[PDB]
UniProtKB/Swiss-Prot annotation, chains A, B:
This is 4-hydroxy-7-methoxy-3-oxo-3,4-dihydro-2H-1,4-benzoxazin-2-yl glucoside beta-D-glucosidase 1, chloroplastic. Keywords: Chloroplast, Cytokinin signaling pathway, Disulfide bond, Glycosidase, Hydrolase, Plastid, Transit peptide. Disulfide bonds join C198-C204. Optimum pH is 5.8. It is found in: Plastid, Chloroplast. Belongs to the glycosyl hydrolase 1 family. Its EC number is 3.2.1.182, 3.2.1.21. Is implicated in many functions such as ABA metabolism, hydrolysis of conjugated gibberellins, conversion of storage forms of cytokinins to active forms. Also acts in defense of young plant parts against pests via the production of hydroxamic acids from hydroxamic acid glucosides. Enzymatic activity is highly correlated with plant growth. The preferred substrate is DIMBOA-beta-D-glucoside. Hydrolyzes the chromogenic substrate 6-bromo-2-naphthyl-beta-D-glucoside (6BNGlc) and various artificial aryl beta-glucosides. Reversibly inhibited by micromolar concentrations of Hg(2+) or Ag(+), but irreversibly inhibited by alkylation in presence of urea. Competitive inhibition by p-nitrophenyl beta-D-thioglucoside (pNPTGlc), glucotetrazole, and para-hydroxy-S-mandelonitrile beta-glucoside (dhurrin). Residues 259-295, 328-339, 384-387 are annotated as: Dimerization. GO terms for cellular component: chloroplast.
Length: 489, 489
């Protein structure tokens, strides 16, 4: 990557935002201290260690509940403009409900972190929910599987309230949800995420759900929850200087072949991945393609739910990592969807028709570098969805570090493959910005190496190394080095 | 229209084709002479004159069965390179079947017509089927409603063999079907065409069919029929110099508003109108949108049928008259398709959001001049469907002439509105051609004023006037005058 091709901070406006992000369950630890209630993930890891690649859990994680001061320190040192982190629902509301009571320690922790960030001039981008549903709600009504579409909605809205109430004065950027598609699809479709539900006959801890129905039920409840929280937010906490939205996980889609069929398959793929949650918050309802394909398996919104959903955001987060080639699949008696994602009638290929991958492999089993994909996504957001304020809330790669193939600390700190990847994506935002894209910021995903869900600790996504052998000592990597130089020059 | 804007023959290639077209039942007459069998239309008009605007029938038509030598004279005098006419199924096979026997008189008629056109240097474009189904087959197995997708396709394939066997040596251009969409939709959807079937509750002669199913059944049979005939043709009659295809009726589609929703609606509209029959003969199956929306109501093809379907043409006909704005309709509990054409989930508007029509009205209830839509249609044919050899097999307008507001022969002859319209579309073909369009010809629709189905004789579409008050005497209109000048310079 040419020396002049390498991004410079002056390439972006002075009001542009650069930061890093994390998620509560992945870094906090102290899973059962100071009154924090049990979460779906606490439950899943403890009860199904066999469902985690290396059978680990996040009881400690990056131990950020105790070491948050150092996290804010690395942020300051790197010269980061902002920090995106999430709030653990069960740590704020142990039972997840109002009557359950608010846990003062949870409030204290987040209150302290936020103040520390401000103190050092780092803007806090708070994600209210990042997959950590209080187990209490999970057993009471299955959480977001809530068939009534009322319970999980009200409890989330209240949770949202407790956050707005205790942090509204200090937090100017809110994100109700993060990666809603990954959450519903992996937790109820493939079953790789807590609680591990999937259609009978599939390989997951609880093969007694419905991969073709539950993800949509969960998704429906997430959208209702989001709408309700934004409604509450806009009415009592919103200030001219504050904003609220949600972040979507999305893989770019490129027509497998030159047939117009694959172009249609590609469109169905954007719809089922990004459109699923984006269109509802934009126009108030699911993509036409999804409704025509999922059918009754995709709930309908009430007229009053659509009004609330439509325009329920001031900004949008995009978590981009890789792209895929979408290959057409014809509707036929020979084909029956099994997973919610099959409803798109398109296979997502890593390799194009020439046998070469859409982009160079970044290390783990799924990330393939293709910054052009981010460009296409931003063009869609710009030309099709109103060109709203966009923040790349996640972007990065995971360095594999297994028991069988340990990543030497030396090799872990020399993360040049990560640096190249980051510099390239940042350059893409520059190209997109010149093209009229409304991108306002970029958050390197994973400030710290941490628990990676079903992958456990087999992957290091941080720009900051965490030596869990030595009390989780943090060491900046080369990528973090460059970011510092980038922000401080 | 500017004089610099008037098309000149030298605008197009020397090999480009210019002609006029007609349909058997509309001009022929002699409905029951020389052993000609009864057709679905003979039957419909006779049994339900209330379903014809002026309660007429085409027993005589323009009397072209007895006056064909004149039609040819008219054609040569205008300088037409070709003439497209259809062959009456019942006139060749009175029982519509092989067992029924071939009617020698029917054969001799088209033998004389073909040879005469050829002796006079006019190329014949033979349309095998134009809605005239032998009433015998209709009563036998419902004709194209044939629920077993065998009888009808077999009988139709025999009919085509007969045509190839007796005219093959002289005909170099065949068209299996003409306007398949209009036939299935109007005969079984809205039921305004013979036999007049529609869903219970709908206003037609026999409200005991199924508007959401029969059109698709008939259409399925037409595609199968078309596939076998081309297979038969390719195997025993095709020559290096001959070609076979079919002509599609199609209205241009333009987004109603600027929403990406209407763009999607527009796409679903091209699909249900053009794609319905075009995609199957291009790739071997119906468009995805239709299968996802029509579902089980739209029959599936056997893998072997898809084989014969894909690539079953050497050229394609396009019958264009007007366009419509496609306005989005969401899938929802507040909507239920009633007609097959409603599966498109889009309302087709004449007036855009501003209240103005898509194009200036041409007189009858449906034609609105919009040459742009022809350009769009050709761009689609070029870029999406392989830019195959295209012939505009129909293009024109119908002048209103009812016994309430009769059209003075003089005014009927001074058809400047028709001329302006014709010149505009011919000009459009020039623009499209330079843009890469593979258009090879243009046929002005309606060589003669004739029977206009449910509109009966209330509309004069011919470029040549037929005075049925004087033994159907033919008189050239100004439009025919110009076409002569155009072809002869
Ligand atoms: C190993 O942990 C993950 C495995 C797969 C995924 C993951 C995390 O995060 C999602 O955003 C994602 O798109 N998939 O591909
Ligand atoms: C009665 O004459 C007709 C009236 C309407 C139609 C027709 C013929 O055939 C096609 O051109 C068509 O698309 N419709 O609109």
């Amino acid at each position: 990557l040419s020396p002049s091709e390498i991004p410079q901070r002056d390439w972006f406006p002075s009001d542009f935002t650069f930061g890093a992000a994390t998620s509560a369950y992945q870094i906090e630890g102290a899973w059962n201290e100071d009154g924090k209630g049990e979460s779906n993930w606490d439950h899943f890891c403890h009860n199904h260690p066999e469902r985690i690649l290396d059978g680990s859990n996040s009881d400690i994680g990056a131990n950020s509940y105790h070491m948050y001061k150092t996290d804010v320190r690395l942020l300051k040192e790197m010269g980061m403009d902002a920090y995106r982190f999430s709030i653990s629902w069960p740590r704020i509301l142990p039972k997840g409900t109002k009557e359950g009571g608010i846990n003062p320690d949870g409030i204290k922790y987040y209150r302290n972190l936020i103040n520390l960030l401000l103190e050092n001039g780092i803007e806090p981008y708070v994600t209210i929910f990042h997959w950590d549903v209080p187990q209490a709600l999970e057993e009471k009504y299955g959480g977001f599987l809530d068939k009534s579409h009322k319970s999980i909605v009200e409890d989330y809205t209240y949770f949202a309230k407790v956050c707005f109430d205790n942090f509204g004065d200090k937090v100017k950027n809110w994100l109700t949800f993060n990666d809603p598609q990954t959450f519903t699809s992996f937790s109820y479709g493939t079953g790789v995420f807590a609680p591990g539900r999937c259609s009978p006959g599939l390989d997951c801890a609880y093969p007694t759900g419905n991969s073709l129905v539950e993800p949509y039920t969960a998704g429906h409840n997430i959208l209702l929850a989001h709408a309700e929280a934004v409604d509450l937010y806009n009415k009592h906490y919103k200030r001219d200087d504050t904003r609220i939205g949600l972040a979507f996980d999305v893989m770019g889609r490129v027509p497998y072949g030159t047939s117009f069929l694959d172009k249609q398959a590609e469109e169905r793929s954007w719809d089922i991945n990004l459109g699923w949650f984006l269109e509802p918050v934009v126009r108030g309802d699911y993509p036409f393609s999804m409704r025509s394909l999922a059918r009754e398996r995709l709930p309908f919104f009430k007229d009053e739910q659509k009004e609330k959903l439509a325009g329920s955001y001031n900004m949008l987060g995009l978590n981009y990592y890789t792209s895929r080639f979408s290959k057409n699949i014809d509707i036929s008696p020979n084909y029956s969807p099994v997973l919610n994602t099959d409803d798109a009638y398109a296979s997502q290929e890593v390799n194009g028709p020439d046998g070469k991958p859409i982009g160079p492999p970044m290390g783990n089993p799924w990330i393939y570098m293709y910054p052009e994909g981010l460009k296409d996504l931003l063009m869609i957001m710009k030309n099709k969805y109103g060109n709203p304020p966009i923040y790349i809330t996640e972007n990065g790669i995971g360095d594999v570090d297994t028991k069988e193939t340990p990543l030497p600390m030396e090799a872990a700190l020399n993360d040049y493959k990560r640096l190249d990847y980051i510099q390239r994506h940042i350059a893409t935002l520059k190209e997109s910005i010149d093209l009229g894209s409304n991108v306002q910021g970029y958050f390197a995903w994973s400030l710290l190496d941490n628990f990676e869900w079903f992958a456990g600790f087999t992957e290091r996504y941080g720009i900051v190394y965490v030596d869990r052998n030595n009390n989780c000592t943090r060491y900046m990597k080369e990528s973090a080095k460059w970011l510092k130089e980038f922000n401080t020059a």
